[PDB]
């Protein structure tokens, strides 16, 4: 269920992370 979206958030999140320090 949408519970997956939460997980898939981690997804775009990890990219967001790889991004965070990237963009900083």
JSON list of N, CA and C in Angstrom, two decimals:
[
{"chain": "A", "resi": 1, "resn": "UNK", "atom": "N", "xyz": [0.87, -1.21, 0.00]},
{"chain": "A", "resi": 1, "resn": "UNK", "atom": "CA", "xyz": [0.00, 0.00, 0.00]},
{"chain": "A", "resi": 1, "resn": "UNK", "atom": "C", "xyz": [0.89, 1.23, 0.00]},
{"chain": "A", "resi": 2, "resn": "UNK", "atom": "N", "xyz": [0.29, 2.40, 0.24]},
{"chain": "A", "resi": 2, "resn": "UNK", "atom": "CA", "xyz": [1.05, 3.64, 0.25]},
{"chain": "A", "resi": 2, "resn": "UNK", "atom": "C", "xyz": [2.22, 3.54, 1.20]},
{"chain": "A", "resi": 3, "resn": "UNK", "atom": "N", "xyz": [2.22, 2.51, 2.02]},
{"chain": "A", "resi": 3, "resn": "UNK", "atom": "CA", "xyz": [3.34, 2.31, 2.91]},
{"chain": "A", "resi": 3, "resn": "UNK", "atom": "C", "xyz": [4.60, 2.27, 2.05]},
{"chain": "A", "resi": 4, "resn": "UNK", "atom": "N", "xyz": [4.43, 1.84, 0.80]},
{"chain": "A", "resi": 4, "resn": "UNK", "atom": "CA", "xyz": [5.55, 1.76, -0.12]},
{"chain": "A", "resi": 4, "resn": "UNK", "atom": "C", "xyz": [6.05, 3.15, -0.46]},
{"chain": "A", "resi": 5, "resn": "UNK", "atom": "N", "xyz": [5.12, 4.10, -0.62]},
{"chain": "A", "resi": 5, "resn": "UNK", "atom": "CA", "xyz": [5.50, 5.47, -0.94]},
{"chain": "A", "resi": 5, "resn": "UNK", "atom": "C", "xyz": [6.49, 5.97, 0.09]},
{"chain": "A", "resi": 6, "resn": "UNK", "atom": "N", "xyz": [6.24, 5.64, 1.35]},
{"chain": "A", "resi": 6, "resn": "UNK", "atom": "CA", "xyz": [7.14, 6.04, 2.42]},
{"chain": "A", "resi": 6, "resn": "UNK", "atom": "C", "xyz": [8.53, 5.51, 2.08]},
{"chain": "A", "resi": 7, "resn": "UNK", "atom": "N", "xyz": [8.59, 4.23, 1.78]},
{"chain": "A", "resi": 7, "resn": "UNK", "atom": "CA", "xyz": [9.84, 3.61, 1.41]},
{"chain": "A", "resi": 7, "resn": "UNK", "atom": "C", "xyz": [10.39, 4.30, 0.17]},
{"chain": "A", "resi": 8, "resn": "UNK", "atom": "N", "xyz": [9.54, 4.47, -0.85]},
{"chain": "A", "resi": 8, "resn": "UNK", "atom": "CA", "xyz": [9.98, 5.13, -2.07]},
{"chain": "A", "resi": 8, "resn": "UNK", "atom": "C", "xyz": [10.35, 6.57, -1.80]},
{"chain": "A", "resi": 9, "resn": "UNK", "atom": "N", "xyz": [10.01, 7.06, -0.62]},
{"chain": "A", "resi": 9, "resn": "UNK", "atom": "CA", "xyz": [10.40, 8.40, -0.25]},
{"chain": "A", "resi": 9, "resn": "UNK", "atom": "C", "xyz": [11.88, 8.32, 0.07]},
{"chain": "A", "resi": 10, "resn": "UNK", "atom": "N", "xyz": [12.26, 7.28, 0.84]},
{"chain": "A", "resi": 10, "resn": "UNK", "atom": "CA", "xyz": [13.66, 7.05, 1.18]},
{"chain": "A", "resi": 10, "resn": "UNK", "atom": "C", "xyz": [14.47, 7.09, -0.11]},
{"chain": "A", "resi": 11, "resn": "UNK", "atom": "N", "xyz": [13.87, 6.52, -1.14]},
{"chain": "A", "resi": 11, "resn": "UNK", "atom": "CA", "xyz": [14.42, 6.47, -2.46]},
{"chain": "A", "resi": 11, "resn": "UNK", "atom": "C", "xyz": [14.88, 7.83, -2.98]},
{"chain": "A", "resi": 12, "resn": "UNK", "atom": "N", "xyz": [13.88, 8.68, -3.17]},
{"chain": "A", "resi": 12, "resn": "UNK", "atom": "CA", "xyz": [14.06, 10.02, -3.66]},
{"chain": "A", "resi": 12, "resn": "UNK", "atom": "C", "xyz": [14.79, 10.76, -2.59]},
{"chain": "A", "resi": 13, "resn": "UNK", "atom": "N", "xyz": [14.73, 10.14, -1.43]},
{"chain": "A", "resi": 13, "resn": "UNK", "atom": "CA", "xyz": [15.40, 10.71, -0.26]},
{"chain": "A", "resi": 13, "resn": "UNK", "atom": "C", "xyz": [16.90, 10.46, -0.34]},
{"chain": "A", "resi": 14, "resn": "UNK", "atom": "N", "xyz": [17.26, 9.23, -0.63]},
{"chain": "A", "resi": 14, "resn": "UNK", "atom": "CA", "xyz": [18.66, 8.84, -0.74]},
{"chain": "A", "resi": 14, "resn": "UNK", "atom": "C", "xyz": [19.30, 9.69, -1.81]},
{"chain": "A", "resi": 15, "resn": "UNK", "atom": "N", "xyz": [18.54, 9.92, -2.86]},
{"chain": "A", "resi": 15, "resn": "UNK", "atom": "CA", "xyz": [18.99, 10.76, -3.92]},
{"chain": "A", "resi": 15, "resn": "UNK", "atom": "C", "xyz": [19.01, 12.16, -3.38]},
{"chain": "A", "resi": 16, "resn": "UNK", "atom": "N", "xyz": [18.04, 12.45, -2.52]},
{"chain": "A", "resi": 16, "resn": "UNK", "atom": "CA", "xyz": [18.00, 13.76, -1.91]},
{"chain": "A", "resi": 16, "resn": "UNK", "atom": "C", "xyz": [19.25, 13.92, -1.07]},
{"chain": "A", "resi": 17, "resn": "UNK", "atom": "N", "xyz": [19.64, 12.83, -0.42]},
{"chain": "A", "resi": 17, "resn": "UNK", "atom": "CA", "xyz": [20.84, 12.81, 0.42]},
{"chain": "A", "resi": 17, "resn": "UNK", "atom": "C", "xyz": [22.07, 12.95, -0.43]},
{"chain": "A", "resi": 18, "resn": "UNK", "atom": "N", "xyz": [22.18, 12.08, -1.40]},
{"chain": "A", "resi": 18, "resn": "UNK", "atom": "CA", "xyz": [23.31, 12.11, -2.27]},
{"chain": "A", "resi": 18, "resn": "UNK", "atom": "C", "xyz": [23.39, 13.50, -2.83]},
{"chain": "A", "resi": 19, "resn": "UNK", "atom": "N", "xyz": [22.23, 14.11, -2.82]},
{"chain": "A", "resi": 19, "resn": "UNK", "atom": "CA", "xyz": [22.06, 15.50, -3.29]},
{"chain": "A", "resi": 19, "resn": "UNK", "atom": "C", "xyz": [22.46, 16.56, -2.26]},
{"chain": "A", "resi": 20, "resn": "UNK", "atom": "N", "xyz": [21.98, 16.37, -1.06]},
{"chain": "A", "resi": 20, "resn": "UNK", "atom": "CA", "xyz": [22.18, 17.37, 0.03]},
{"chain": "A", "resi": 20, "resn": "UNK", "atom": "C", "xyz": [23.58, 17.90, 0.08]},
{"chain": "A", "resi": 21, "resn": "UNK", "atom": "N", "xyz": [24.47, 16.98, 0.34]},
{"chain": "A", "resi": 21, "resn": "UNK", "atom": "CA", "xyz": [25.87, 17.26, 0.46]},
{"chain": "A", "resi": 21, "resn": "UNK", "atom": "C", "xyz": [26.41, 17.65, -0.89]},
{"chain": "A", "resi": 22, "resn": "UNK", "atom": "N", "xyz": [25.72, 17.19, -1.90]},
{"chain": "A", "resi": 22, "resn": "UNK", "atom": "CA", "xyz": [26.08, 17.49, -3.25]},
{"chain": "A", "resi": 22, "resn": "UNK", "atom": "C", "xyz": [25.80, 18.95, -3.54]},
{"chain": "A", "resi": 23, "resn": "UNK", "atom": "N", "xyz": [24.56, 19.35, -3.29]},
{"chain": "A", "resi": 23, "resn": "UNK", "atom": "CA", "xyz": [24.16, 20.73, -3.51]},
{"chain": "A", "resi": 23, "resn": "UNK", "atom": "C", "xyz": [24.77, 21.62, -2.43]},
{"chain": "A", "resi": 24, "resn": "UNK", "atom": "N", "xyz": [24.55, 21.24, -1.17]},
{"chain": "A", "resi": 24, "resn": "UNK", "atom": "CA", "xyz": [25.08, 21.97, -0.03]},
{"chain": "A", "resi": 24, "resn": "UNK", "atom": "C", "xyz": [25.15, 23.47, -0.33]}
]
